[PDB]
């Protein structure tokens, strides 16, 4: 076989399990020999409205078969694939849309309007399912692992930069779940987080396509709809970010929803709190808690259910991490550093960024903008995103570690932690907090309460409260605060 | 980490699992942890004794933690391992000493006597654990996935050939396995067939280390300690050829020995007969029948337990198999050609033997020579081996078939069937069968079953009678006749 990448995999699939259900959304169920021909049948529409080897389709919808079908094509076609995250307006389309140089956009059609509105120069905008031939025999074009499979936009929290992940790169984090997560053949594995992120599509949804499990697609997350599907589908496999394991166990149905079907509930993001894990653990779940990010499609720590409360855990098995100096030298035992990231799962680059490349890319060793310590056992602790330290005096400020304790505060519902210039200092902390439902918050007294639990130079020498923070987005914060 | 390959096994696992059990042996027991610090040691103690990069280090004993710490000590030193059949004789052992170019040769004590024996120019012969240093820190020396991890040589059924699977090879083997077989972390792996071969070593050991199990090693097959483990031990994997499975269940303790452990049972070799599937069957156990070569690394074609007898099943994810004619071009639907085979688990090439390889490597396709027939659901069914065809008339005489009948007939414990010379046909098929315990056999009688059972031209013209033949070796048998 020529093609050695993504596009593949639904032929390569169909011969193992062809009968066996791959994809279920809404009414919708795909067999695997069902997904390959569709696959085909989008990989010749693409190839017949002008797609070539190396050029970029655009995907603007939901969670949907269409995300999955758009994926493989491109990979079939021997394109790159762009899953734009489906939230953005229209400037930040236009901006993804003009930097990727996508030539074809495939949307659902609730993006119709929107659609409209890009500036549509050189772009071919098609709702999704008309690009589809009649033929569907697979094609097999020449795709090397090192070939760029899809593009995947950062935050830009300047402009958003485009991942390079290769074949390669997706193909080897699968290696990693599968090496240091339990899926078999019957895995049912519940998508409610956004197949555009690379936890989603990488830890969950191709690993388990790749052991000829079945993937059900939630366009959106609702708790109660996903405690309903745990229990009527018997989902045996989750991924979320605390937030939605925290929201799901919060809705009413909970006390009530069998969870027995539950093998590997994979947790994303921050920490999970220990409140949290508390009320998984009354029910006999606990959580594989996976640190990541984009550049590395995305796994680069596990910590599986063995006792480290805060740990972010241990290399996956084909990655490398160290916590190096500003200087790539290693750090002295337990001392605080960067988190730098090697293996055959770390990007190819960011699309036509060269010399940002090369700020974070080097020796194959990407650094992950973490600021970290690593204990005498190997395992990793996240102190915080070294482009929000606070240099107060001679010394650093983590806001993450400020902004830990201010949610010990009665009334804190939402806060983060600024520098502000200081003639004195050059810069000291702020404080910014949304207070709760109804609640006598006195800015002096929640002040006082932070001196108490925290070295002096480290409190934030005042408060502001305001209803509204800018979701978690620090910079914003920066320019209101 | 600049070692990519099968040496940086035992590291990457220690970061993970590092007080998981990873081998026992009899007494011994070891951590990953304690196995990475003897691979260290051994590694050490290679370079101190003169090992250096692509240098070659053979092994000489039975399955014992010795074979692993040798194999993963090699790829840390960034040599080449020989696993050396232990049953071969002095002037066998040299020929492949001398091949491999090997210069340090381990042996566990029952070779001693073996060893002493050897050409002993240029090799250093030592006993297991004499070349272990003190200094358990790992080397990082850079291996790349195309460098060569071990030689393992064919039957030679010529000379014996250096099959050079590549860290890549034997990696991406590893990676078939675990998306096409459902393992996990608490897999508990019964190695009784030998680790000189890829069959246990690729499909059952590697694997089960990968994730961070534990493998049992038995040095010698013995159907009643093999029973007492499966239940004793709580073995979930075990990997045998249908001898195996026939002899444990044949074994008297079979009837009362606790097998609810077993969750999965490896088959490879020979099809297993359905009378052997049955006695399984009643136990609740089913075969996961695998298809592969030495050159695959070795896996190539999976039957799961899903319901076609006779069928070799279909290729692993990462490979591409195919019936080919005699000049590559693919055969008709149900025609008979030869499997070839392609993918990151296929061989560089046969050691030294350049010409050698081009006659069965060429494009990345391994000529298999099996004669094979594809059904239109892409199952694969093994006629026989290429070479063993006899040429009768115009037809082609395929003795496998010719021989599956033959063990129908009454006191057939073995029998062969190979080609002689005919003035009118250029050849003709002659049985040489062994009777089985006190059976009055007439070779008359023999004949005219067999004739009524097969094409007449498929008959052979005449039987004789032996007590032994030679192994199943044909080639011996076209000698005595």
């Given at each position: ?408 505060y009665p009334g804190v519902e939402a ?18 907090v949304v207070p709760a439902a109804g609640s006598r918050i006195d ?22 409260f305001?209803d ?14």
């Amino acid at each position: 076989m020529r093609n050695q990448g993504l596009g593949s995999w639904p032929v390569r699939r169909a011969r193992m399990s062809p009968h066996a259900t791959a994809v279920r959304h809404g009414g919708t169920a795909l067999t695997y020999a069902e997904l390959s021909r569709r696959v085909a049948r989008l990989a010749h529409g693409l190839r017949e409205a002008g797609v070539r080897p190396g050029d970029r389709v655009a995907y603007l919808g939901p969670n949907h078969p269409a995300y999955l079908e758009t994926l493989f094509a491109c990979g079939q076609a021997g394109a790159v694939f762009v899953p734009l995250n489906f939230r953005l307006g229209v400037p930040e389309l236009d901006h993804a849309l003009a930097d990727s140089g996508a030539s074809v956009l495939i949307h659902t059609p609730e993006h119709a309007e929107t659609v409209a509105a890009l500036a549509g120069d050189r772009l071919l905008r098609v709702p999704a399912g008309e690009l589809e031939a009649a033929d569907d025999e697979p094609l097999d074009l020449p795709v090397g692992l090192d070939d760029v499979c899809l593009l995947m936009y950062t935050s830009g929290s300047g402009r958003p930069k485009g991942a390079m992940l290769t074949h390669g790169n997706l193909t080897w984090n699968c290696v990693n779940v599968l090496v240091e997560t339990d899926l078999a053949s019957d895995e049912r594995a519940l998508v409610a987080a956004p197949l555009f992120h690379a936890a989603a599509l990488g830890m969950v949804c191709l690993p388990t396509l790749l052991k000829g499990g079945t993937v059900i697609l939630h366009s959106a997350f609702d708790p109660g709809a996903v405690l309903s599907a745990v229990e009527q589908e018997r989902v045996t496999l989750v991924f979320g970010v605390p937030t939605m394991y925290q929201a799901i166990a919060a809705h009413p149905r909970w006390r009530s929803t069998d969870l027995s079907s539950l093998r590997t509930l994979l947790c994303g993001g921050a920490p999970v709190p220990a409140d949290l894990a508390g009320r998984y653990l009354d029910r006999g779940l606990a959580f594989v808690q996976g640190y990541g990010m984009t550049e590395a499609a995305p796994g680069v720590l596990v910590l599986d259910r063995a006792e480290k409360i805060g740990s972010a855990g241990v290399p996956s098995f084909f990655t490398d991490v160290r916590v190096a100096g500003p200087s790539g030298e290693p750090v002295p035992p337990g001392e605080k550093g960067e988190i730098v990231v090697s293996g055959p799962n770390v990007m190819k680059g960011y699309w036509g960024r060269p010399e940002a490349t090369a700020e974070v890319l080097r020796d194959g060793w990407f650094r992950s903008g973490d600021v970290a310590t690593v204990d005498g056992d190997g395992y990793f602790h996240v102190v915080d995103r070294l482009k929000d330290m606070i240099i107060s005096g001679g010394e650093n400020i983590y806001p993450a570690e400020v902004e830990n304790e201010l949610y010990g505060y009665p009334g804190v519902e939402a806060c983060a932690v600024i520098g502000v210039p200081d003639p004195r200092w050059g810069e000291v902390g702020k404080a910014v907090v949304v207070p709760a439902a109804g609640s006598r918050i006195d800015g002096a007294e929640l002040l006082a309460w932070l001196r108490t639990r925290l070295a002096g130079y480290k409190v934030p020498k005042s408060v502001e409260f305001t209803d509204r923070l800018p979701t978690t987005g620090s910079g914003k914060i920066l320019k209101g605060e």
